[PDB]
Amino acid sequence: SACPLRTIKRVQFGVLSPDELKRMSVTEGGIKYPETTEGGRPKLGGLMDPRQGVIERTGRCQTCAGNMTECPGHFGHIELAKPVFHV
Amino acid sequence: EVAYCSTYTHCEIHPSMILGVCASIIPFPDHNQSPRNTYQSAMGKQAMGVYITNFHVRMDTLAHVLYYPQKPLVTTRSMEYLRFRELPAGINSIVAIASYTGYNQEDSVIMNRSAVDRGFFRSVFYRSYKEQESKKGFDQEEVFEKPTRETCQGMRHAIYDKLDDDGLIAPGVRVSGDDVIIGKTVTLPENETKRDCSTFLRTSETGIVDQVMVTLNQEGYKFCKIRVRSVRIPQIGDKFASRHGQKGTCGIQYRQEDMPFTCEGITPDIIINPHAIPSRMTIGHLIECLQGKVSANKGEIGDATPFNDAVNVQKISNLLSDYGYHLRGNEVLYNGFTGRKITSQIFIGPTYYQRLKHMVDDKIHSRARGPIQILNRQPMEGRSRDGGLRFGEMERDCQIAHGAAQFLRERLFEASDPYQVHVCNLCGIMAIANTRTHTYECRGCRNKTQISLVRMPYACKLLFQELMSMSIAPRMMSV
Amino acid sequence: DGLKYSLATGNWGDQKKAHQARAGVSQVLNRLTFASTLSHLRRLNSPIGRDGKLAKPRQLHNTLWGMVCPAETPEGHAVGLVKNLALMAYISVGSQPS
Amino acid sequence: MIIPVRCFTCGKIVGNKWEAYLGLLQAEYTEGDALDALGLKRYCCRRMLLAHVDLIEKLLNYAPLEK
Amino acid sequence: TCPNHPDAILVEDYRAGDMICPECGLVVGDRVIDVGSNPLLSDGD
Amino acid sequence: SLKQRLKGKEGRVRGNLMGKRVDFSARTVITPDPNLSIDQVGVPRSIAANMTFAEIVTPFNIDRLQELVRRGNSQYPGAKYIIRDNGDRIDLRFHPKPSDLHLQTGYKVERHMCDGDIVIFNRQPTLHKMSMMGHRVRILPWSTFRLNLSVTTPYNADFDGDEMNLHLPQSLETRAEIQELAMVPRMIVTPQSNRPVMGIVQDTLTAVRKFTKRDVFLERGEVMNLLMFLSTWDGKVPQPAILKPRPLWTGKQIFSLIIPGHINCIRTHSTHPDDEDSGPYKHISPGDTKVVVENGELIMGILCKKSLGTSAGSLVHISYLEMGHDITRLFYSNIQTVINNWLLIEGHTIGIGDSIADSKTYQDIQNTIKKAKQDVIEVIEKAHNNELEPTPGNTLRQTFENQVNRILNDARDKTGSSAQKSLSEYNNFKSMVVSGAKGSKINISQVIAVVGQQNVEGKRIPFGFKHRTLPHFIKDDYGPESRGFVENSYLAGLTPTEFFFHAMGGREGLIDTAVKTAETGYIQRRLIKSMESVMVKYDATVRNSINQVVQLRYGEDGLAGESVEFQNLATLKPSN
Amino acid sequence: FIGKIPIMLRSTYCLLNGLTDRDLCELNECPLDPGGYFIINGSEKVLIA
Amino acid sequence: MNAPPAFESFLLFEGEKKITINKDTKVPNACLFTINKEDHTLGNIIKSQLLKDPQVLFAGYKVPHPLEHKIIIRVQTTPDYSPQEAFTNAITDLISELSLLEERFRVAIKDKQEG
Amino acid sequence: IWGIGCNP
Amino acid sequence: PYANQPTVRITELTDENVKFIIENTDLAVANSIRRVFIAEVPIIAIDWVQIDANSSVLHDEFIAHRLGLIPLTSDDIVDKLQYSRDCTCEEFCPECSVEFTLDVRCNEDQTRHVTSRDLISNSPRVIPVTSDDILIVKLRKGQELRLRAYAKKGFGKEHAKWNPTAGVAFEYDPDNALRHTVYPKPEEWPKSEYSELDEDESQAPYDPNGKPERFYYNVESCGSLRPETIVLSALSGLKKKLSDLQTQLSHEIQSDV
Amino acid sequence: MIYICGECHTENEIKSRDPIRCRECGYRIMYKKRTKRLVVFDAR
Amino acid sequence: YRHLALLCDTMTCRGHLMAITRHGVNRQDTGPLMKCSFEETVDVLMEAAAHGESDPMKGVSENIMLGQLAPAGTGCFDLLLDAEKCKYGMEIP
Amino acid sequence: QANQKRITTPYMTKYERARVLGTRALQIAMCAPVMVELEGETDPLLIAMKELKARKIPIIIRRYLPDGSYEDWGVDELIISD
RNA sequence: UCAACG
Ligand SMILES: CO[C@@H]1[C@H](O)[C@H](n2cnc3c(=O)nc(N)[nH]c32)O[C@H]1COP(=O)(O)OP(=O)(O)OP(=O)(O)O
Ligand SMILES: [Mg+2]
Ligand SMILES: [Zn+2]
Ligand SMILES: [Zn+2]
Ligand SMILES: [Zn+2]
Ligand SMILES: [Zn+2]
Ligand SMILES: [Zn+2]
Ligand SMILES: [Zn+2]
């Protein structure tokens, strides 16, 4: 709320740097677990990460107190073992 | 005769058999324009009437049955084999083709309110709701019972008093919109009690429960079907159509005093605009009115087989002349409001009019700050879900043409999906932001000072994030 | 289950394979009016795609005299692609040629 | 389904005349003669009796829901 | 969780999708219903 | 996939960003209402009660909003919510404390929609700019939107089950935008064709022709009643045209009071004889055509579609161009009310008596058809003998079809003309065709004389069976009946073969409608997307978003399309 | 036993075949009902030709 | 669902005035009477009787909207006569006409029976 | 439905 | 500036029909009288129905509608009865309503026709015009209909169930002489029953001085009221409406000044 | 909690969580009986 | 004639006939988001990302997408408050 | 730009009138002082219309020329389109 | 998915 309100005057498009992807993603070490559920509901380092986004419409994601509205979601990264062409 | 062919090998049984089931109910089809016959074939499927004699036993969704069906006064011979006399759909109505108050203009129709009071075109709408008590879940059992606000952690504030002990409302109880027809409870696994699972009436049904049935379905689980009955008196939005392709809503309803009246005292049940007839060229409607006048006076159901050559307008006109009316069917009308004779003589005669399933009550919708979708956080879609009307791309182009930039902005951003995001100034990518903590930080720069708030539609946020997931970076920079 | 599935879904084929399935068969009977019930039972559906706007399969043909109703067709995106049988028309059940 | 009380257009009570109309038809009166004998004069009233379809007999054929 | 009403049960609403304090009518949570939205066979796949 | 989500229609790019579902919108069936003004729309009470427009509490309006708050949601002129300064929203339905109901400056009370609230009215498809127009709201007690009949022409809407969308602006800024840019009176004249979009239509047009005839004379009481419905009446009864023996006003005299201000216009009625202008009685017209309005008074003439319709130079167009938009709105409404109340006295109808013609006319039609069939037979016999000579650039089959079609078309038109001669003054088909409200000379001809040749794909009915149109006809029959000519009129009734052929023609009509909708939609969208950003800058150059100069001045003269009018240069044609 | 085949109503293999109208009424089935439709999962489905 | 109750057409809701008299500024000696919850029945009689009066220059009645229930009656009288006076005198005359008609209809009934 | 030059 | 003095001649008077001619009257007055016949003559008819058991094929609201349309004799009691809104008692009392009760069960094999004769009224004066019978519903064996209903005073402006008349025939200028209706072909049109012209002449010659007068009436009754009583009550009710207007107008005139 | 039976039209009282089968006929199609509370119907 | 001439001028402004199609319209050097709204969508976005294109945000569609006020009419100008005039006049409330 | 060398149209465009009236009305609703004496006008938009007629609206319109420069016309200076 | 509505 303290941040000043601004209107976008220019949108710059570019391919995301892999280093920037690593830094930006809240998930650390990648998504190590195919399963989405650990400890019953939440799987850290899994597809459904509490830090990645708000779940169940009442929880708060770890990174921010979103409450299912404030949080815009946060990205995660998967470190592919061998590189793959982008289609 | 003068020789055309002397080697005929077969002969047609009757030329009217080329027409199908729906086109056979049209009287005098050969006197109509072809597109109008095509339109009547579609409208006849949507008319109201007793669909089947065992309708009381049947529990069907969306069943309409007219109060007082009547068989046509002017009927085709092939209707007998379609059983249209046995199960008619529509009422013969004294129809005047006149311009009375301007409320019958375009395709609308002025209807007699007194006739409507006496049962004219009154129908019943039955809606059936089905619910199944499913025990298939490992620890979930959808038992039928009356939910209690204190006992059930999940509940709703709509009326639950109607439900009996079994959780099913008794037949004969009025149900208004947003009432609980069936009460069901799913037992909740205690991961560490009740998420409400009742079924609620469609808004504005405003009916009385007719039948409630409890059985076991194919799967063996307990099955309950509840049929709700709502009478439907015609209104000023309901759609009425004749057998000649003339469809129109009810413009207004005048009482018997206000309707124009002949010298005998007959007031038209329905007034249709004269402007409908010429462009559409549905002369069959006019001939059916003439034959109906003749038939009602004579006492014999008129014959309207498509190709007869024994029934002509001139013969019908002479027959009507015998019964004391003007030969072309026109009658001297008096104005209901003032009593003065209408200078032009209005064409009045009985005509089979049908009542279509489209009614204004079912088609009226209003939305204001309702529920929003999960994926887009935009208003829902459909009348059932209280959805807002879509502001399409053509609509936004019209608004651009107007130059109403701020109405366009309101309609496409503020009314639908307002949202706020925090964007790093150094890098256009969005940044994590804890409003309660009041600490705003951007990953990838290790920069906290340079973050700006940006207001964008939630759909645009979703688009930018989906672009990021495809490795495209939509870096929105305020500078 | 095969027969019941193909009837209920409206897809003509198997559950696993929908590639060769033809949708539009086995629609729910309309019970608004007895006329609608009867017409729904006596209905023909041309396989030509609705999306294609080429007008040749839609136009009434001279050979439809007495076999198919000329007037009764849906007005909209399916003009002439859905047809209703005439009153006297009778589709042949089939026989052996021996 | 059943003969309407009070013919729609004018309001004359026509619900008491259905059984008499059927009886007069059994007595070999023509429909027009029966309508004349019943007193129905305006074509609006005659429409009611002439075009009525009595479905309630067909409905009564079905056994009652509760005996 | 009405701020002026400690331990107040907020009644659910269907019209706008919010929980509202019944004694003062304050709307706690603006549009917080949204849409609000076989485990038996096998397991997680 | 992500690309699948974004790419298709109803994806994020188009289905959720360019257009989206919106709040404060409502939809229901539309039904006519002649009494409402052009700008008014009739909103049902339930739709009005659900929709709310937030009003800021000011010292001026604190009392009124307090009363609305006290009424609550249940009573119709009530308030659904109270929005405090803090942003807290107090839903009045669930019990609010009496303390909460108190209002202070800065609170925003969300009142129910009331009479006079500006809304935007839309009907899909929104082909042109006039399809979204701002309407004032008048609450009436039934469940259909009710709009005036003249406003139907811009929307291309008739009341046969149609529906329209109602969008309520929620801010004073956007409400003013609608009020001053998109209200219905402001968009009477379209910039597309510099003609008025809205014109008198249906009963009012048909009745205005009859009202304005020389014959119509109104007595004292009827004039009283007609003047009662005239909203801009000065209160002074005009001096009757016929003072003695009995005071009797004329239709034109009363319509002169409807005409706004002082408008000068000369137009011609549809039935204007061509020779009249050259010959004598040019100014004292014998048939009362040549509408002339001087000093806002109808001196002479019979009004019709040309005078009061949607065409350049019409009386409505001259009113908008000269008097202004407000007075023109009053003009439309007053014409409708006064003429529609006269129509109760006069009345209109359509019956079989209109379709039937004199016996002599029927005999003439039959004779025309007989000699036409004989001529077609002679052409066929010439073709069989190979005496026919091919038209240059055409095959013998093509030239045979050309000549046969010419003979049949000439017969068809001649029969139509005989039928049209038969029509009397009282004939109502002629009333509607002459006034221009509905119908055409072609429809009258098909109703009375001859339906005409049925053509499919630009030719006569083709040989669907082997070398014959239907099994009933003999092989290789190129005659009139075999290939589709429908000799009988609709009143007479088509013979069975002609019925099938007529069905074939009508099916072609239906198919063309269905195809044209889709193709035109695509074209319209592409044009808009190509030119969406082009606009007149403050340099008055027309530039796109890139700031490239499309035109140095708009239209090459820097004028807008609605102001311009057709005019004759008058220096060009004359000799030296 | 190799399975179950859905039965079109009022065909030869249906129960209603060859039943007088009074008997159809006794089964709470309409005498005028055309037949020609399957009752699959409780809903009447019609095979469009 | 939005249908008005039937009794609304003839029953005055509380706080509604049957007659409200508002003068007309445009023309001298003219008053515009608004009658609530009344229809063409009353309006036509009153307008006709007003027209019969030699001192009434203008008299007409208008139902502003058929869905709403209201009559607007404009009466303009010559100087030395008041529109309100003309309205009252019209009502008295119509009452006298109806009373005379009732007496004569009763006499006709009694004569037709047993005579 | 009229002629070849008109409408169908 | 005074009211014309009308006259009345009654040509026919039967149990269900009154024909009369009003002369020396304005058209507006005559049309208003005709209008009051239809919409403003009070009659008693059923408006409240509580159905205890309904096993008939017709649903409950169907039965209530049919019951409402059934005419009830209201010859003299309708003047005594007060409108339910006027009565001080809550809901309905004998002064403000009449109670009708119906109990019919079919135990015979033969179909039982529930008729209006089965409606039983607590007040002798109000009876369903029985002294055939209107068929409310037909009942199969084992089907039962039991209901209780109250009947209220009202006029046709509320609902057509309170319409006293069947058809009111109004005609003036039987031979077109004021040319209020302009016949395109005068000869084709049938002559009126009241026409005084010879067969040769189709229309009377135009009379510019003439104005509508000598209005012809034919009032038919549903049996609810005597046909004479319909006309007399309509005249009286219109007189009462005018007198109420006069009272309110006097109040407004005095208050403004 | 009295259910009328389709086949034999005999009312049978059924407690909660009890099988829906009519004694004396065995039919599994039951109808709930008309409520005791009464609804006012306008004849209109 | 204005409306016809404008279409002709837009099609022939660049010097090569610009078809009103995805090809002709998208080839012109407009903003990538504006091209994205018309037909090609995702492919336009991918190409723009690859070449580092920047959206000027002067178009109407681009502003509509981001929820900002369009540069269309009623958005071409920016209103500013006039302090001196606020001081003058009768400030009743 | 300088106050001199103003090249834009002296007349107020329709879009400017719309936005000026709406903005001034929104200000009036938020209890901004009103220059014009109101004759019992409570609706903010109507008061704004009165002010515009009197040319007392305290807003200066900044018109952006396509070259990037801006010209500041006060509402008073511009001729009302009406 | 199908079926209607413009
Ligand atoms: C007059 O034009 C309208 C509009 O163009 C709009 N509309 C309708 N259907 C569609 C559609 O499928 N797709 C699109 N885009 N628009 C559509 O409907 C058209 C007419 O259709 P109709 O010809 O049936 O109108 P009748 O002449 O039939 O009117 P009656 O006498 O029944 O009232
Ligand atoms: Mg339409
Ligand atoms: Zn978060
Ligand atoms: Zn950053
Ligand atoms: Zn009748
Ligand atoms: Zn609280
Ligand atoms: Zn009482
Ligand atoms: Zn049993």
Structural contact between residues B476 and B464, judged by C-beta atoms closer than 8 angstroms: yes
DSSP B334-358: B-TTT-PBPSSPEEEEEEEEEEBS-
Return the amino acid letter for J192.
Answer: S
Map out the domains of chain D with their CATH numbers.
1-67 (1.10.10.60)
Q: 3-state SS string over C43-76?
A: EEECCCCCCCCCCCCCCCCHHHCCCECCCCCCCC
Tokens of B10: 């077969």
Strand partners, B208: B174, B229
User: Among F507, F520, F454, F201, which residue's Cα sits nearest to residue F335?
Assistant: F201
The residues near B162 (Cβ < 8 Å, ≥ 6 apart) are B169, B170, B173, B175, B179, B180
Distance between CA atoms of residues F285 and F303, nearest Å: 14
Q: 3-state SS string over F21-32?
A: ECCCEEEEEEEE
Tell me, what CATH number does H96's domain have? 3.30.1360.10
Tokens of F87: 């942003």
Distance between CA atoms of residues J159 and J47, nearest Å: 10
Distance between CA atoms of residues E11 and E26, nearest Å: 11
Q: Whose CA is nearest to atom 4 of ligand 1?
A: F156
Structural contact between residues F545 and F563, judged by C-beta atoms closer than 8 angstroms: no
Sign of the CA dihedral with L13 first, then L16, L17, and L19 last: negative
User: What angle is formed at CA L63 by the lines to CA L62 and CA L69, rounded to 5 degrees?
Assistant: 165
Reduce the DSSP state of residue F9 to 3 states and report it.
coil
Exposed/middle/buried for F54, CB within 10 Å: 0-12, 13-18, 19+? middle
Tell me, what CATH number does F324's domain have? 1.10.274.100
Distance between CA atoms of residues G30 and B87, nearest Å: 12
The total of structural domains in chain J comes to: 2
Distance between CA atoms of residues D14 and B300, nearest Å: 19
Q: Among residues J109, J137, J160, which one ends one of the domains? A: J160
Structural contact between residues C77 and C50, judged by C-beta atoms closer than 8 angstroms: yes
Taking the centre of ligand 7 as the mean of its atom positions, its distance from the CA of residue F347, in whole angstroms, is 48
Q: What are phi and psi of F386, to 5 degrees?
A: 65, 15
Rounding to the nearest 10 degrees, give the CA dihedral for residues B227, B232, B237, B243.
Answer: 100
Structural contact between residues B29 and F499, judged by C-beta atoms closer than 8 angstroms: yes
Structural contact between residues J132 and D16, judged by C-beta atoms closer than 8 angstroms: yes
User: What angle is formed at CA B101 by the lines to CA B96 and CA B107, rounded to 5 degrees?
Assistant: 60
Distance between CA atoms of residues M51 and F252, nearest Å: 42
Distance between CA atoms of residues M49 and F268, nearest Å: 42
The pairing of beta strand B199-200 with beta strand B194-196:
unpaired
The pairing of beta strand J98-105 with beta strand J165-171:
unpaired
Distance between CA atoms of residues B300 and B305, nearest Å: 15
Distance between CA atoms of residues F427 and F432, nearest Å: 9
**Which residue segment(s) compose the domain that J250 sits in?**
1-42+161-257
Distance between CA atoms of residues B409 and B396, nearest Å: 10
Exposed/middle/buried for B257, CB within 10 Å: 0-12, 13-18, 19+? buried
Contact flag F507-C75 (C-beta cutoff 8 Å): no
Secondary element (H or E) of residue F137:
strand F132-139
Distance between CA atoms of residues B62 and B478, nearest Å: 55
CA-based diameter of chain L, in Å?
63
Length of chain C: 98
Give nearest nucleotide to C23 (CA–C1'): N1
Distance between CA atoms of residues B361 and B64, nearest Å: 14
Structural contact between residues D66 and K2, judged by C-beta atoms closer than 8 angstroms: no
Omega into C97 within 30° of 0, i.e. cis? Answer: no
DSSP-derived secondary structure letter, B122: -
Tell me, what CATH number does J56's domain have? 2.170.120.12
User: Among C67, C35, C4, which residue's Cα sits nearest to residue G34?
Assistant: C35
Secondary element (H or E) of residue B66:
strand B63-66
User: Among B379, M22, B238, which residue's Cα sits nearest to residue F167?
Assistant: B379
Tell me, what CATH number does J216's domain have? 3.30.1360.10
Structural contact between residues B3 and C67, judged by C-beta atoms closer than 8 angstroms: no
Tell me, what CATH number does M23's domain have? 3.90.940.10
> Which whole-number Å values give the CA distances from F319 to F260, F332, J126, in the listed order?
7, 10, 65
Structural contact between residues B425 and B450, judged by C-beta atoms closer than 8 angstroms: yes
Enumerate the residues of chain B whose CB falls inside 8 A of the CB of residue C35: 21-22, 25, 44-45, 47, 82, 84, 89
Q: 3-state SS string over L59-80?
A: CHHHHHHCCCCCCCCCCCCEEE
The residues near C4 (Cβ < 8 Å, ≥ 6 apart) are G6, G40, G41
DSSP-derived secondary structure letter, B126: E
**Which residue segment(s) compose the domain that B409 sits in?**
383-470
- 3-state DSSP helix/strand/coil percent for chain G, to nearest 5? 10, 15, 70
Structural contact between residues B368 and F50, judged by C-beta atoms closer than 8 angstroms: yes
Q: Among residues J160, J186, J212, which one ends one of the domains? A: J160
Structural contact between residues H108 and J9, judged by C-beta atoms closer than 8 angstroms: yes
The total of structural domains in chain H comes to: 1
Length of chain L: 93
Question: Which protein residues have a C-beta closer than 7 A to any atom of strand N?
Answer: B 42-43, 46, 247, 358; C 10, 23-24, 27, 30, 45, 74-76, 78, 82; F 124-125, 158, 160-163
Omega into F125 within 30° of 0, i.e. cis? Answer: yes
Structural contact between residues B434 and B440, judged by C-beta atoms closer than 8 angstroms: yes
Tokens of F529: 């997307």
User: Among F27, F67, F31, F25, which residue's Cα sits nearest to residue F140?
Assistant: F31
How many Å apart are F165 CA and N1 C1'?
28
Q: What are phi and psi of J193, to 5 degrees?
A: -65, -25
Give nearest nucleotide to F123 (CA–C1'): N6
Distance between CA atoms of residues F314 and F265, nearest Å: 8
User: What angle is formed at CA B59 by the lines to CA B54 and CA B65, rounded to 5 degrees?
Assistant: 60
Other Cβ atoms less than 10 A from the Cβ of B270: the count is: 25
Strand partners, K40: J50
Give the helix ranges, DSSP H, for B299-331.
313-322
The residues near H114 (Cβ < 8 Å, ≥ 6 apart) are none
Distance between CA atoms of residues A38 and A19, nearest Å: 29
**Ligand 1 atom with the shortest distance to the CA of B35:** 28
Secondary element (H or E) of residue B278:
helix B276-280
R_g of chain I, CA atoms, integer Å: 4
> Which whole-number Å values give the CA distances from L14 to B207, B414, L8, in the listed order?
66, 37, 11
The residues near F385 (Cβ < 8 Å, ≥ 6 apart) are none
The residues near C52 (Cβ < 8 Å, ≥ 6 apart) are none
Task: Indicate the angle between helix axes F496-531 and L2-12, nearest 10 degrees.
Answer: 60
Enumerate the residues of chain F whose CB falls inside 8 A of the CB of residue I1: 446, 451-452, 454, 486, 502, 505-506, 509
Structural contact between residues J17 and J220, judged by C-beta atoms closer than 8 angstroms: yes
- 3-state DSSP helix/strand/coil percent for chain J, to nearest 5? 25, 25, 45
Q: 3-state SS string over D28-52?
A: CCCHHHHHHHHCCCCHHHHHHHHHE
Distance between CA atoms of residues B60 and B80, nearest Å: 27
Enumerate the residues of chain B whose CB falls inside 8 A of the CB of residue H66: 101, 103, 252, 254
Q: 3-state SS string over M51-78?
A: HHHHCCCCEEEEEECCCCCEEEEECCCC
Return the amino acid letter for J50.
Answer: Q
User: What angle is formed at CA F86 by the lines to CA F81 and CA F91, rounded to 5 degrees?
Assistant: 20
Chain N positions with an atom below 7 A of a protein C-beta are 1-6
User: Among H56, J158, F182, which residue's Cα sits nearest to residue B255?
Assistant: J158
Q: What are phi and psi of F164, to 5 degrees?
A: -140, 160
> Which whole-number Å values give the CA distances from F346 to A23, A62, B344, in the listed order?
85, 80, 6
Contact flag A24-B443 (C-beta cutoff 8 Å): yes
- Give the residue from chain C lying closest to B358, CA to CA: C32
User: Among F352, F324, F316, F318, which residue's Cα sits nearest to residue F489?
Assistant: F352
Distance between CA atoms of residues F122 and F168, nearest Å: 11
The pairing of beta strand J135-139 with beta strand J112-115:
antiparallel
Q: J174 and J110: one domain?
A: no
Q: J167 and J107: one domain?
A: no
The residues near A18 (Cβ < 8 Å, ≥ 6 apart) are none
Instruction: Classify domain K1-44 at the CATH superfamily level.
Output: RNA polymerase ii, chain L (2.20.28.30)
Exposed/middle/buried for J191, CB within 10 Å: 0-12, 13-18, 19+? middle
Q: What are phi and psi of C83, to 5 degrees?
A: -135, 155
Rounding to the nearest 10 degrees, give the CA dihedral for residues B150, B153, B158, B162.
Answer: -60
The residues near F538 (Cβ < 8 Å, ≥ 6 apart) are L76, M8, M9, M63, M64, M65, M66, M71
Please identify which residue in the block is written with the tokens 């269900």: J16
Q: J172 and J256: one domain?
A: yes
Distance between CA atoms of residues H68 and H70, nearest Å: 6
Distance between CA atoms of residues F3 and F11, nearest Å: 9
**Which residue segment(s) compose the domain that M62 sits in?**
1-82
Other Cβ atoms less than 10 A from the Cβ of B89: the count is: 30
Q: What are phi and psi of D56, to 5 degrees?
A: -70, -25
Return the amino acid letter for B91.
Answer: I
> Which whole-number Å values give the CA distances from M42 to F54, F57, F136, F179, M46, in the listed order?
16, 11, 19, 18, 8
Q: What are phi and psi of J112, to 5 degrees?
A: -100, 125
Q: What are phi and psi of H8, to 5 degrees?
A: -70, -20
Length of chain H: 115
Strand partners, J219: J18, J168
Enumerate the residues of chain B whose CB falls inside 8 A of the CB of residue D9: 94, 112, 115, 266-267, 269
The pairing of beta strand B109-112 with beta strand B247-254:
parallel
Residues, CB within 5 angstroms of ligand 6 (ion):
E 2, 5, 21, 24, 26
User: Among L33, F16, L68, which residue's Cα sits nearest to residue A13?
Assistant: L33
Tell me, what CATH number does B420's domain have? 3.90.1800.10
Reduce the DSSP state of residue F196 to 3 states and report it.
strand
Q: Whose CA is nearest to atom 2 of ligand 1?
A: F156
Distance between CA atoms of residues F380 and F474, nearest Å: 15
The residues near B260 (Cβ < 8 Å, ≥ 6 apart) are B96, B98, B100, B267, B268, B271, B333, B334, B335, B336, B342, B346
The residues near F411 (Cβ < 8 Å, ≥ 6 apart) are F368, F369, F371, F372, F450
The residues near B441 (Cβ < 8 Å, ≥ 6 apart) are B431, B432, B447, B448, B451
E44 in a known ligand binding site:
no
Ligand 1 is surrounded, with C-beta below 6 A, by: B 107, 247, 280; C 76; F 125, 156, 158, 160, 513, 517, 521
CA-based diameter of chain A, in Å?
46
Distance between CA atoms of residues F554 and L5, nearest Å: 10
Structural contact between residues B396 and L64, judged by C-beta atoms closer than 8 angstroms: yes
CA F558 from centroid of its chain's CA atoms? 30
**Which residue segment(s) compose the domain that H65 sits in?**
1-115
Distance between CA atoms of residues F352 and B284, nearest Å: 10
- Residue H47, min C-alpha distance to chain J (Å): 9
Please identify which residue in the block is written with the tokens 């005035």: H17
Strand partners, J120: J101
Task: Indicate the angle between helix axes B313-322 and B283-298, nearest 10 degrees.
Answer: 30
Distance between CA atoms of residues B331 and F353, nearest Å: 12
Q: Is F484 left (phi over 0), alpha (psi -120 to 50) or beta?
A: left
The total of structural domains in chain M comes to: 1
Q: Among residues J127, J160, J193, which one ends one of the domains? A: J160
Tokens of F382: 């010439």
The residues near B86 (Cβ < 8 Å, ≥ 6 apart) are D53, D55, D58, G32
Exposed/middle/buried for B190, CB within 10 Å: 0-12, 13-18, 19+? exposed
Structural contact between residues F119 and B410, judged by C-beta atoms closer than 8 angstroms: no
